[PDB]
Amino acid sequence: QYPIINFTTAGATVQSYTNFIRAVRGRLTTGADVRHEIPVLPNRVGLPINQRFILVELSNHAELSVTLALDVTNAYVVGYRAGNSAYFFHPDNQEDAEAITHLFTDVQNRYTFAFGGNYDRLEQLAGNLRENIELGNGPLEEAISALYYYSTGGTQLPTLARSFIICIQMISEAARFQYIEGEMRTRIRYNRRSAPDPSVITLENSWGRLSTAIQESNQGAFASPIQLQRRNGSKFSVYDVSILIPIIALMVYRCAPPPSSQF
Ligand SMILES: Nc1nc(=O)c2ncc(C(=O)NCC(=O)N[C@@H](Cc3ccccc3)C(=O)N[C@@H](Cc3ccccc3)C(=O)O)nc2[nH]1
């Protein structure tokens, strides 16, 4: 009963990818919370379990399919299904462990990895950092096959973790940031895979901090500027929510919106 959004890497175009990312965002946000014109994801506090997850069904040219589960509170990929097996990252807490029991309920082989799903852990397992892992339609196509074959020994753990890293950035990070969506559009349009540059990496690393800075801002003004990087690695200071409107698509819930003290 959780919502399902479909995407295939087979014959993918900028438009089909765009449609996909827009649909994911539509299922993540409720319209209940928008601040400085930027939507906020649902608050985990009091969120009914029946509204907690969405499903992303990925298919490829190889005619394989896998289903990712995303937590609506943070767009986080919490696990996946391939045929008769489902795999979940190690939960951060009891409440999350219980919540994932509500996913892929009729799968006959349920596994919970002993490792969590954050980039740091996955990069260690992968033997490579994000900055050295190519993204694009080709990597996603290959990632889907890798996830599919894991249960039968065909996929090494390093290649699984690498494949997770690809999926997370092309789905979850793209949903969070129009900027990253745009980066993926480019790669898809020209069918040219490439690793993420510093502008992409710093945005991913800063999502929580940007979310908090905006929500705690004084009428949009940050108390403390945040440093990001442009493509060439050079510094870019963010002082205000204004410059982020075309860059960030969704925020994680960090605080309550203050009473809108009007003039
Ligand atoms: N499986 C998976 N799905 C994702 O969507 C995902 N998305 C992001 C990351 C990831 O490590 N991000 C690196 C990072 O620095 N994250 C920031 C911002 C953030 C990103 C995603 C979600 C929440 C916050 C952060 O505060 N990370 C936390 C750790 C954390 C907490 C909750 C969820 C993921 C990571 C920290 O450094 O303290 N890992 C993911 N893993």
Side-chain angles (χ1 to χ4, degrees), residues 69-71 73-79 89 92 116-123 130 164-165 167-169 171-173 176-177 201-211 252 254:
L70 279 61
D71 185 330
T73 62
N74 54 15
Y76 194 97
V77 176
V78 302
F89 298 113
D92 296 345
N118 296 345
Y119 287 142
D120 198 342
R121 198 67 169 93
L122 294 178
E123 291 170 332
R130 278 169 282 162
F164 282 139
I165 290 171
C167 291
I168 296 159
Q169 295 178 267
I171 300 166
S172 302
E173 305 286 12
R176 294 164 181 142
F177 294 98
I201 301 301
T202 60
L203 275 174
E204 296 172 349
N205 295 338
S206 309
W207 186 57
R209 281 288 169 83
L210 297 160
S211 291
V252 59
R254 284 288 177 250

mmCIF file of all heavy atoms in Angstrom, residues 69-71 73-79 89 92 116-123 130 164-165 167-169 171-173 176-177 201-211 252 254, ligand 1:
data_model
loop_
_atom_site.group_PDB
_atom_site.id
_atom_site.type_symbol
_atom_site.label_atom_id
_atom_site.label_comp_id
_atom_site.label_asym_id
_atom_site.label_seq_id
_atom_site.Cartn_x
_atom_site.Cartn_y
_atom_site.Cartn_z
ATOM 1 N N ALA A 69 13.367 1.068 -0.846
ATOM 2 C CA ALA A 69 12.477 1.672 0.129
ATOM 3 C C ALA A 69 13.111 2.959 0.641
ATOM 4 O O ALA A 69 14.235 2.951 1.124
ATOM 5 C CB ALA A 69 12.198 0.715 1.273
ATOM 6 N N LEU A 70 12.382 4.064 0.522
ATOM 7 C CA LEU A 70 12.840 5.351 1.032
ATOM 8 C C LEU A 70 11.990 5.800 2.217
ATOM 9 O O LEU A 70 10.765 5.722 2.183
ATOM 10 C CB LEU A 70 12.798 6.425 -0.060
ATOM 11 C CG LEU A 70 13.949 6.501 -1.062
ATOM 12 C CD1 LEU A 70 14.077 5.232 -1.860
ATOM 13 C CD2 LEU A 70 13.700 7.678 -2.005
ATOM 14 N N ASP A 71 12.667 6.280 3.251
ATOM 15 C CA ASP A 71 12.042 6.812 4.448
ATOM 16 C C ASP A 71 11.614 8.244 4.107
ATOM 17 O O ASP A 71 12.437 9.025 3.658
ATOM 18 C CB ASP A 71 13.107 6.792 5.546
ATOM 19 C CG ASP A 71 12.578 7.210 6.901
ATOM 20 O OD1 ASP A 71 11.633 8.014 6.952
ATOM 21 O OD2 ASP A 71 13.128 6.732 7.917
ATOM 22 N N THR A 73 10.847 10.738 5.919
ATOM 23 C CA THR A 73 11.357 11.783 6.811
ATOM 24 C C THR A 73 12.695 12.358 6.343
ATOM 25 O O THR A 73 13.038 13.486 6.690
ATOM 26 C CB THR A 73 11.518 11.288 8.268
ATOM 27 O OG1 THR A 73 12.477 10.228 8.317
ATOM 28 C CG2 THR A 73 10.178 10.806 8.831
ATOM 29 N N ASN A 74 13.451 11.591 5.560
ATOM 30 C CA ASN A 74 14.779 12.050 5.126
ATOM 31 C C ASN A 74 15.191 11.639 3.710
ATOM 32 O O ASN A 74 16.319 11.925 3.283
ATOM 33 C CB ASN A 74 15.846 11.593 6.125
ATOM 34 C CG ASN A 74 15.800 10.095 6.380
ATOM 35 O OD1 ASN A 74 15.181 9.346 5.624
ATOM 36 N ND2 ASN A 74 16.460 9.650 7.448
ATOM 37 N N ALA A 75 14.286 10.959 3.001
ATOM 38 C CA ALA A 75 14.532 10.436 1.649
ATOM 39 C C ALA A 75 15.603 9.333 1.635
ATOM 40 O O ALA A 75 16.103 8.936 0.578
ATOM 41 C CB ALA A 75 14.902 11.563 0.695
ATOM 42 N N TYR A 76 15.934 8.840 2.819
ATOM 43 C CA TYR A 76 16.978 7.840 3.002
ATOM 44 C C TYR A 76 16.581 6.465 2.449
ATOM 45 O O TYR A 76 15.454 6.012 2.642
ATOM 46 C CB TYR A 76 17.265 7.757 4.500
ATOM 47 C CG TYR A 76 18.512 7.032 4.903
ATOM 48 C CD1 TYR A 76 19.683 7.728 5.179
ATOM 49 C CD2 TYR A 76 18.507 5.655 5.055
ATOM 50 C CE1 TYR A 76 20.834 7.056 5.573
ATOM 51 C CE2 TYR A 76 19.644 4.973 5.447
ATOM 52 C CZ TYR A 76 20.803 5.677 5.700
ATOM 53 O OH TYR A 76 21.920 4.986 6.090
ATOM 54 N N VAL A 77 17.493 5.812 1.733
ATOM 55 C CA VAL A 77 17.228 4.459 1.241
ATOM 56 C C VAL A 77 17.479 3.468 2.367
ATOM 57 O O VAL A 77 18.625 3.295 2.784
ATOM 58 C CB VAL A 77 18.159 4.094 0.065
ATOM 59 C CG1 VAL A 77 17.941 2.639 -0.384
ATOM 60 C CG2 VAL A 77 17.968 5.060 -1.097
ATOM 61 N N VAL A 78 16.432 2.807 2.859
ATOM 62 C CA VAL A 78 16.599 1.968 4.055
ATOM 63 C C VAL A 78 16.798 0.483 3.741
ATOM 64 O O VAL A 78 17.154 -0.300 4.623
ATOM 65 C CB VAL A 78 15.432 2.115 5.055
ATOM 66 C CG1 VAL A 78 15.278 3.573 5.499
ATOM 67 C CG2 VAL A 78 14.139 1.593 4.453
ATOM 68 N N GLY A 79 16.581 0.113 2.488
ATOM 69 C CA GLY A 79 16.765 -1.263 2.064
ATOM 70 C C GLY A 79 16.167 -1.489 0.697
ATOM 71 O O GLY A 79 15.670 -0.559 0.063
ATOM 72 N N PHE A 89 19.489 -2.015 5.584
ATOM 73 C CA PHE A 89 20.639 -1.523 6.335
ATOM 74 C C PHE A 89 20.343 -1.590 7.830
ATOM 75 O O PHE A 89 19.174 -1.618 8.234
ATOM 76 C CB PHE A 89 21.010 -0.080 5.961
ATOM 77 C CG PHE A 89 21.402 0.091 4.529
ATOM 78 C CD1 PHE A 89 20.615 0.821 3.659
ATOM 79 C CD2 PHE A 89 22.570 -0.475 4.052
ATOM 80 C CE1 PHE A 89 20.978 0.975 2.340
ATOM 81 C CE2 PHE A 89 22.937 -0.323 2.733
ATOM 82 C CZ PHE A 89 22.146 0.389 1.878
ATOM 83 N N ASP A 92 19.244 2.683 12.888
ATOM 84 C CA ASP A 92 19.852 3.584 13.863
ATOM 85 C C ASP A 92 19.236 3.440 15.252
ATOM 86 O O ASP A 92 19.819 3.896 16.233
ATOM 87 C CB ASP A 92 19.684 5.050 13.445
ATOM 88 C CG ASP A 92 20.400 5.393 12.150
ATOM 89 O OD1 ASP A 92 21.263 4.609 11.706
ATOM 90 O OD2 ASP A 92 20.105 6.472 11.583
ATOM 91 N N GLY A 116 25.376 -0.164 8.758
ATOM 92 C CA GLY A 116 24.431 0.893 8.418
ATOM 93 C C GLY A 116 24.621 1.371 6.988
ATOM 94 O O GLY A 116 25.561 0.954 6.315
ATOM 95 N N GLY A 117 23.745 2.263 6.529
ATOM 96 C CA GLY A 117 23.746 2.682 5.139
ATOM 97 C C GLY A 117 24.340 4.037 4.803
ATOM 98 O O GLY A 117 24.158 4.513 3.690
ATOM 99 N N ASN A 118 25.055 4.660 5.732
ATOM 100 C CA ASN A 118 25.655 5.964 5.454
ATOM 101 C C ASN A 118 26.829 5.871 4.471
ATOM 102 O O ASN A 118 27.452 4.817 4.325
ATOM 103 C CB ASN A 118 26.108 6.648 6.744
ATOM 104 C CG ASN A 118 24.953 6.979 7.677
ATOM 105 O OD1 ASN A 118 23.787 6.958 7.282
ATOM 106 N ND2 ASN A 118 25.279 7.301 8.925
ATOM 107 N N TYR A 119 27.129 6.978 3.801
ATOM 108 C CA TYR A 119 28.196 7.001 2.803
ATOM 109 C C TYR A 119 29.521 6.498 3.373
ATOM 110 O O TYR A 119 30.218 5.725 2.719
ATOM 111 C CB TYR A 119 28.412 8.410 2.252
ATOM 112 C CG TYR A 119 27.335 8.907 1.318
ATOM 113 C CD1 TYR A 119 26.930 10.233 1.357
ATOM 114 C CD2 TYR A 119 26.725 8.057 0.405
ATOM 115 C CE1 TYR A 119 25.952 10.702 0.516
ATOM 116 C CE2 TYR A 119 25.744 8.524 -0.448
ATOM 117 C CZ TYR A 119 25.357 9.844 -0.375
ATOM 118 O OH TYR A 119 24.385 10.331 -1.200
ATOM 119 N N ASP A 120 29.880 6.936 4.576
ATOM 120 C CA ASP A 120 31.179 6.570 5.146
ATOM 121 C C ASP A 120 31.343 5.053 5.184
ATOM 122 O O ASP A 120 32.347 4.516 4.711
ATOM 123 C CB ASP A 120 31.361 7.164 6.546
ATOM 124 C CG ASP A 120 32.816 7.177 6.997
ATOM 125 O OD1 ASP A 120 33.641 6.451 6.409
ATOM 126 O OD2 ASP A 120 33.137 7.918 7.949
ATOM 127 N N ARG A 121 30.347 4.365 5.730
ATOM 128 C CA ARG A 121 30.379 2.914 5.795
ATOM 129 C C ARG A 121 30.424 2.302 4.396
ATOM 130 O O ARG A 121 31.218 1.405 4.124
ATOM 131 C CB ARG A 121 29.163 2.387 6.556
ATOM 132 C CG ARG A 121 29.303 0.963 7.041
ATOM 133 C CD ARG A 121 30.378 0.874 8.121
ATOM 134 N NE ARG A 121 30.374 -0.419 8.799
ATOM 135 C CZ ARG A 121 31.135 -1.445 8.437
ATOM 136 N NH1 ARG A 121 31.964 -1.316 7.406
ATOM 137 N NH2 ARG A 121 31.075 -2.594 9.104
ATOM 138 N N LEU A 122 29.560 2.782 3.509
ATOM 139 C CA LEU A 122 29.479 2.219 2.166
ATOM 140 C C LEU A 122 30.765 2.445 1.372
ATOM 141 O O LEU A 122 31.174 1.575 0.602
ATOM 142 C CB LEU A 122 28.275 2.795 1.405
ATOM 143 C CG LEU A 122 26.877 2.447 1.931
ATOM 144 C CD1 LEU A 122 25.785 3.123 1.093
ATOM 145 C CD2 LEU A 122 26.649 0.937 1.986
ATOM 146 N N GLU A 123 31.394 3.606 1.545
ATOM 147 C CA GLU A 123 32.648 3.901 0.847
ATOM 148 C C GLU A 123 33.762 2.976 1.319
ATOM 149 O O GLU A 123 34.613 2.576 0.530
ATOM 150 C CB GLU A 123 33.073 5.346 1.078
ATOM 151 C CG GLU A 123 32.171 6.368 0.403
ATOM 152 C CD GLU A 123 32.470 7.776 0.854
ATOM 153 O OE1 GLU A 123 32.943 7.939 1.993
ATOM 154 O OE2 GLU A 123 32.239 8.721 0.073
ATOM 155 N N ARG A 130 33.038 8.552 -2.812
ATOM 156 C CA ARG A 130 32.104 9.097 -3.783
ATOM 157 C C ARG A 130 32.810 9.801 -4.939
ATOM 158 O O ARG A 130 32.391 9.699 -6.086
ATOM 159 C CB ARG A 130 31.144 10.070 -3.097
ATOM 160 C CG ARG A 130 29.999 9.400 -2.411
ATOM 161 C CD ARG A 130 29.262 10.407 -1.542
ATOM 162 N NE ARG A 130 29.982 10.642 -0.291
ATOM 163 C CZ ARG A 130 29.781 11.695 0.487
ATOM 164 N NH1 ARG A 130 28.890 12.613 0.134
ATOM 165 N NH2 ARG A 130 30.447 11.819 1.627
ATOM 166 N N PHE A 164 24.965 0.719 -4.242
ATOM 167 C CA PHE A 164 24.140 1.533 -3.343
ATOM 168 C C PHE A 164 24.511 3.012 -3.464
ATOM 169 O O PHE A 164 23.640 3.886 -3.559
ATOM 170 C CB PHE A 164 24.331 1.102 -1.887
ATOM 171 C CG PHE A 164 23.589 -0.146 -1.516
ATOM 172 C CD1 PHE A 164 24.179 -1.104 -0.707
ATOM 173 C CD2 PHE A 164 22.304 -0.357 -1.961
ATOM 174 C CE1 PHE A 164 23.496 -2.256 -0.361
ATOM 175 C CE2 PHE A 164 21.614 -1.508 -1.607
ATOM 176 C CZ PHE A 164 22.212 -2.450 -0.808
ATOM 177 N N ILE A 165 25.806 3.299 -3.428
ATOM 178 C CA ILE A 165 26.270 4.680 -3.517
ATOM 179 C C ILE A 165 25.747 5.370 -4.789
ATOM 180 O O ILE A 165 25.321 6.518 -4.745
ATOM 181 C CB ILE A 165 27.807 4.762 -3.392
ATOM 182 C CG1 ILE A 165 28.230 4.415 -1.958
ATOM 183 C CG2 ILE A 165 28.306 6.138 -3.765
ATOM 184 C CD1 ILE A 165 29.721 4.243 -1.774
ATOM 185 N N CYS A 167 22.918 4.463 -6.581
ATOM 186 C CA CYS A 167 21.470 4.626 -6.406
ATOM 187 C C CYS A 167 21.097 5.769 -5.475
ATOM 188 O O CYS A 167 20.213 6.563 -5.779
ATOM 189 C CB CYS A 167 20.833 3.351 -5.858
ATOM 190 S SG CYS A 167 20.824 1.982 -7.014
ATOM 191 N N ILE A 168 21.754 5.847 -4.329
ATOM 192 C CA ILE A 168 21.399 6.868 -3.360
ATOM 193 C C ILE A 168 21.576 8.257 -3.973
ATOM 194 O O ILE A 168 20.720 9.118 -3.844
ATOM 195 C CB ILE A 168 22.238 6.747 -2.068
ATOM 196 C CG1 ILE A 168 21.935 5.419 -1.362
ATOM 197 C CG2 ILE A 168 22.009 7.966 -1.155
ATOM 198 C CD1 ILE A 168 23.039 4.989 -0.413
ATOM 199 N N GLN A 169 22.674 8.474 -4.685
ATOM 200 C CA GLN A 169 22.920 9.817 -5.189
ATOM 201 C C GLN A 169 21.990 10.148 -6.348
ATOM 202 O O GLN A 169 21.520 11.274 -6.479
ATOM 203 C CB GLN A 169 24.369 9.975 -5.622
ATOM 204 C CG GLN A 169 25.339 9.857 -4.478
ATOM 205 C CD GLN A 169 26.771 9.964 -4.940
ATOM 206 O OE1 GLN A 169 27.439 8.956 -5.220
ATOM 207 N NE2 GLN A 169 27.251 11.183 -5.040
ATOM 208 N N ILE A 171 19.011 9.009 -6.872
ATOM 209 C CA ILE A 171 17.610 9.047 -6.483
ATOM 210 C C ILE A 171 17.395 9.974 -5.286
ATOM 211 O O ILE A 171 16.740 11.007 -5.417
ATOM 212 C CB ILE A 171 17.087 7.633 -6.172
ATOM 213 C CG1 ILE A 171 17.217 6.750 -7.415
ATOM 214 C CG2 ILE A 171 15.640 7.691 -5.688
ATOM 215 C CD1 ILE A 171 17.047 5.293 -7.130
ATOM 216 N N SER A 172 17.960 9.622 -4.131
ATOM 217 C CA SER A 172 17.749 10.412 -2.915
ATOM 218 C C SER A 172 18.377 11.812 -2.979
ATOM 219 O O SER A 172 17.722 12.811 -2.680
ATOM 220 C CB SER A 172 18.253 9.652 -1.680
ATOM 221 O OG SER A 172 17.588 8.404 -1.557
ATOM 222 N N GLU A 173 19.651 11.903 -3.347
ATOM 223 C CA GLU A 173 20.271 13.232 -3.441
ATOM 224 C C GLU A 173 19.657 14.102 -4.546
ATOM 225 O O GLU A 173 19.511 15.321 -4.387
ATOM 226 C CB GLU A 173 21.782 13.109 -3.628
ATOM 227 C CG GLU A 173 22.446 12.278 -2.548
ATOM 228 C CD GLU A 173 22.536 13.021 -1.202
ATOM 229 O OE1 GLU A 173 21.892 14.081 -1.028
ATOM 230 O OE2 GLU A 173 23.269 12.527 -0.314
ATOM 231 N N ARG A 176 16.577 15.534 -3.197
ATOM 232 C CA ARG A 176 16.826 16.579 -2.208
ATOM 233 C C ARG A 176 17.279 17.890 -2.840
ATOM 234 O O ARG A 176 16.986 18.956 -2.301
ATOM 235 C CB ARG A 176 17.877 16.146 -1.184
ATOM 236 C CG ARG A 176 17.468 14.992 -0.294
ATOM 237 C CD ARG A 176 18.693 14.408 0.387
ATOM 238 N NE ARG A 176 18.356 13.274 1.249
ATOM 239 C CZ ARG A 176 19.120 12.196 1.379
ATOM 240 N NH1 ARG A 176 20.258 12.097 0.696
ATOM 241 N NH2 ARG A 176 18.744 11.211 2.180
ATOM 242 N N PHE A 177 18.028 17.809 -3.941
ATOM 243 C CA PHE A 177 18.675 18.990 -4.525
ATOM 244 C C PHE A 177 18.389 19.110 -6.016
ATOM 245 O O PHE A 177 18.820 18.250 -6.791
ATOM 246 C CB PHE A 177 20.196 18.898 -4.375
ATOM 247 C CG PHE A 177 20.691 18.957 -2.956
ATOM 248 C CD1 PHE A 177 21.005 17.791 -2.282
ATOM 249 C CD2 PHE A 177 20.883 20.179 -2.314
ATOM 250 C CE1 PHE A 177 21.478 17.826 -0.995
ATOM 251 C CE2 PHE A 177 21.363 20.220 -1.014
ATOM 252 C CZ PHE A 177 21.660 19.045 -0.357
ATOM 253 N N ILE A 201 29.419 16.869 -3.951
ATOM 254 C CA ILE A 201 29.815 16.289 -2.671
ATOM 255 C C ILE A 201 29.531 17.206 -1.476
ATOM 256 O O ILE A 201 28.996 16.759 -0.475
ATOM 257 C CB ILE A 201 31.312 15.916 -2.636
ATOM 258 C CG1 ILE A 201 31.639 14.912 -3.743
ATOM 259 C CG2 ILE A 201 31.678 15.337 -1.267
ATOM 260 C CD1 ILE A 201 30.849 13.662 -3.649
ATOM 261 N N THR A 202 29.902 18.477 -1.569
ATOM 262 C CA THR A 202 29.683 19.381 -0.442
ATOM 263 C C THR A 202 28.199 19.610 -0.165
ATOM 264 O O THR A 202 27.795 19.766 0.985
ATOM 265 C CB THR A 202 30.447 20.729 -0.577
ATOM 266 O OG1 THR A 202 30.030 21.432 -1.758
ATOM 267 C CG2 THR A 202 31.944 20.475 -0.640
ATOM 268 N N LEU A 203 27.380 19.614 -1.210
ATOM 269 C CA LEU A 203 25.945 19.765 -1.013
ATOM 270 C C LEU A 203 25.414 18.554 -0.254
ATOM 271 O O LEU A 203 24.675 18.698 0.710
ATOM 272 C CB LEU A 203 25.215 19.908 -2.351
ATOM 273 C CG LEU A 203 25.155 21.313 -2.942
ATOM 274 C CD1 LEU A 203 24.529 21.261 -4.336
ATOM 275 C CD2 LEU A 203 24.414 22.289 -2.000
ATOM 276 N N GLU A 204 25.813 17.359 -0.684
ATOM 277 C CA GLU A 204 25.363 16.138 -0.027
ATOM 278 C C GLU A 204 25.771 16.151 1.433
ATOM 279 O O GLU A 204 24.971 15.855 2.317
ATOM 280 C CB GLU A 204 25.954 14.901 -0.694
ATOM 281 C CG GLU A 204 25.510 14.691 -2.129
ATOM 282 C CD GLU A 204 26.266 13.578 -2.819
ATOM 283 O OE1 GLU A 204 27.274 13.110 -2.249
ATOM 284 O OE2 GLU A 204 25.855 13.169 -3.933
ATOM 285 N N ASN A 205 27.028 16.490 1.684
ATOM 286 C CA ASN A 205 27.515 16.520 3.054
ATOM 287 C C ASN A 205 26.854 17.582 3.920
ATOM 288 O O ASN A 205 26.836 17.445 5.150
ATOM 289 C CB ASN A 205 29.038 16.665 3.097
ATOM 290 C CG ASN A 205 29.743 15.465 2.497
ATOM 291 O OD1 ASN A 205 29.177 14.375 2.417
ATOM 292 N ND2 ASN A 205 30.979 15.658 2.085
ATOM 293 N N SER A 206 26.282 18.612 3.294
ATOM 294 C CA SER A 206 25.762 19.747 4.065
ATOM 295 C C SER A 206 24.245 19.805 4.220
ATOM 296 O O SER A 206 23.720 20.743 4.832
ATOM 297 C CB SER A 206 26.248 21.077 3.472
ATOM 298 O OG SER A 206 27.653 21.077 3.282
ATOM 299 N N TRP A 207 23.546 18.821 3.668
ATOM 300 C CA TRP A 207 22.081 18.877 3.596
ATOM 301 C C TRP A 207 21.460 19.127 4.965
ATOM 302 O O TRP A 207 20.580 19.970 5.097
ATOM 303 C CB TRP A 207 21.517 17.597 2.994
ATOM 304 C CG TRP A 207 20.023 17.632 2.764
ATOM 305 C CD1 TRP A 207 19.334 18.539 2.019
ATOM 306 C CD2 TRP A 207 19.060 16.688 3.252
ATOM 307 N NE1 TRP A 207 17.998 18.229 2.021
ATOM 308 C CE2 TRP A 207 17.804 17.103 2.762
ATOM 309 C CE3 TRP A 207 19.140 15.540 4.045
ATOM 310 C CZ2 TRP A 207 16.631 16.400 3.053
ATOM 311 C CZ3 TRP A 207 17.967 14.845 4.335
ATOM 312 C CH2 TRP A 207 16.731 15.270 3.828
ATOM 313 N N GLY A 208 21.909 18.378 5.971
ATOM 314 C CA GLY A 208 21.390 18.537 7.317
ATOM 315 C C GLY A 208 21.651 19.925 7.866
ATOM 316 O O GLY A 208 20.763 20.564 8.464
ATOM 317 N N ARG A 209 22.868 20.404 7.641
ATOM 318 C CA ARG A 209 23.280 21.714 8.134
ATOM 319 C C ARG A 209 22.562 22.862 7.428
ATOM 320 O O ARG A 209 22.186 23.852 8.060
ATOM 321 C CB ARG A 209 24.797 21.885 7.994
ATOM 322 C CG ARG A 209 25.600 21.183 9.089
ATOM 323 C CD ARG A 209 25.432 21.922 10.412
ATOM 324 N NE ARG A 209 25.961 21.183 11.559
ATOM 325 C CZ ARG A 209 27.240 21.183 11.928
ATOM 326 N NH1 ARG A 209 28.136 21.873 11.231
ATOM 327 N NH2 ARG A 209 27.627 20.486 12.992
ATOM 328 N N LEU A 210 22.405 22.749 6.112
ATOM 329 C CA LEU A 210 21.604 23.714 5.366
ATOM 330 C C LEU A 210 20.143 23.704 5.825
ATOM 331 O O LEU A 210 19.526 24.767 5.976
ATOM 332 C CB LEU A 210 21.684 23.427 3.861
ATOM 333 C CG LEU A 210 23.072 23.551 3.240
ATOM 334 C CD1 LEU A 210 23.129 22.775 1.913
ATOM 335 C CD2 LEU A 210 23.443 25.014 3.024
ATOM 336 N N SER A 211 19.590 22.512 6.029
ATOM 337 C CA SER A 211 18.216 22.389 6.488
ATOM 338 C C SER A 211 18.028 23.109 7.810
ATOM 339 O O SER A 211 17.072 23.850 7.988
ATOM 340 C CB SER A 211 17.791 20.927 6.616
ATOM 341 O OG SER A 211 17.691 20.345 5.330
ATOM 342 N N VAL A 252 15.128 18.270 5.451
ATOM 343 C CA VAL A 252 14.731 17.417 6.562
ATOM 344 C C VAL A 252 14.156 18.305 7.682
ATOM 345 O O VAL A 252 14.623 19.422 7.896
ATOM 346 C CB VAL A 252 15.917 16.542 7.066
ATOM 347 C CG1 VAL A 252 17.086 17.407 7.519
ATOM 348 C CG2 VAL A 252 15.470 15.619 8.182
ATOM 349 N N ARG A 254 13.835 19.962 10.990
ATOM 350 C CA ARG A 254 14.832 20.194 12.042
ATOM 351 C C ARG A 254 14.261 20.939 13.245
ATOM 352 O O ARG A 254 14.598 20.641 14.391
ATOM 353 C CB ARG A 254 16.066 20.922 11.494
ATOM 354 C CG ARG A 254 17.008 20.044 10.684
ATOM 355 C CD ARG A 254 17.765 19.091 11.584
ATOM 356 N NE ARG A 254 18.631 18.166 10.856
ATOM 357 C CZ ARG A 254 18.399 16.862 10.744
ATOM 358 N NH1 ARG A 254 17.322 16.329 11.306
ATOM 359 N NH2 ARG A 254 19.242 16.087 10.072
HETATM 360 N N1 LIG B 1 21.330 4.445 2.470
HETATM 361 C C1 LIG B 1 21.429 5.802 2.398
HETATM 362 N N2 LIG B 1 20.421 6.539 1.832
HETATM 363 C C2 LIG B 1 20.485 7.885 1.745
HETATM 364 O O1 LIG B 1 19.576 8.575 1.228
HETATM 365 C C3 LIG B 1 21.694 8.541 2.280
HETATM 366 N N3 LIG B 1 21.860 9.871 2.241
HETATM 367 C C4 LIG B 1 22.976 10.392 2.748
HETATM 368 C C5 LIG B 1 23.964 9.587 3.314
HETATM 369 C C6 LIG B 1 25.177 10.230 3.901
HETATM 370 O O2 LIG B 1 26.004 9.526 4.450
HETATM 371 N N4 LIG B 1 25.288 11.555 3.890
HETATM 372 C C7 LIG B 1 26.519 12.154 4.363
HETATM 373 C C8 LIG B 1 26.261 13.296 5.309
HETATM 374 O O3 LIG B 1 27.189 13.987 5.682
HETATM 375 N N5 LIG B 1 25.001 13.493 5.689
HETATM 376 C C9 LIG B 1 24.612 14.651 6.479
HETATM 377 C C10 LIG B 1 23.318 15.266 5.939
HETATM 378 C C11 LIG B 1 22.253 14.192 5.880
HETATM 379 C C12 LIG B 1 22.136 13.387 4.753
HETATM 380 C C13 LIG B 1 21.153 12.402 4.711
HETATM 381 C C14 LIG B 1 20.296 12.213 5.786
HETATM 382 C C15 LIG B 1 20.411 13.019 6.915
HETATM 383 C C16 LIG B 1 21.389 14.002 6.958
HETATM 384 C C17 LIG B 1 24.465 14.286 7.931
HETATM 385 O O4 LIG B 1 24.099 15.114 8.750
HETATM 386 N N6 LIG B 1 24.753 13.025 8.248
HETATM 387 C C18 LIG B 1 24.753 12.540 9.614
HETATM 388 C C19 LIG B 1 24.690 11.017 9.590
HETATM 389 C C20 LIG B 1 23.356 10.564 9.032
HETATM 390 C C21 LIG B 1 22.200 10.681 9.801
HETATM 391 C C22 LIG B 1 20.974 10.262 9.290
HETATM 392 C C23 LIG B 1 20.900 9.723 8.009
HETATM 393 C C24 LIG B 1 22.053 9.608 7.239
HETATM 394 C C25 LIG B 1 23.282 10.024 7.748
HETATM 395 C C26 LIG B 1 25.978 12.978 10.369
HETATM 396 O O5 LIG B 1 27.096 13.290 9.713
HETATM 397 O O6 LIG B 1 25.968 13.048 11.589
HETATM 398 N N7 LIG B 1 23.837 8.247 3.370
HETATM 399 C C27 LIG B 1 22.729 7.677 2.875
HETATM 400 N N8 LIG B 1 22.543 6.360 2.895
#
